Amino acid sequence: MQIFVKTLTGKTITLEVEPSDTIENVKAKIQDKEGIPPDQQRLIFAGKQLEDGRTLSDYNIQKESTLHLVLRLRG
Question: Taken in order 45, 49, 52, 55, is the CA torsion positive or negative?
């Protein structure tokens, strides 16, 4: 299985994943490719924001699906 991760500015990151992969797991994959800490990560699927505990299948995310990556900072 393979999904796409969308970056703010632009570019198409492609992630190789499993359907039962947890959202924490995807974030760990992104960290390898984008050196971005999972704490500063926010994944969006079809407008919705995903949560660490649920897996790709819980959100009914199949292959060739795009998740929008959005850094999360504050102060």
Answer: negative
Domains of the chain: 1-75 (3.10.20.90)
Elucidated via: X-ray
Q: Which helix (H) or strand (E) holds 24?
A: helix 23-34
> 41-51: b or e for each residue (b if 16 or more CB lie within 10 Å)?
bebebeeeebe
- Count of residues making up the chain: 75
Experimental resolution (Å): 3.0
What DSSP element (H or E) covers 48?
A: strand 48-49
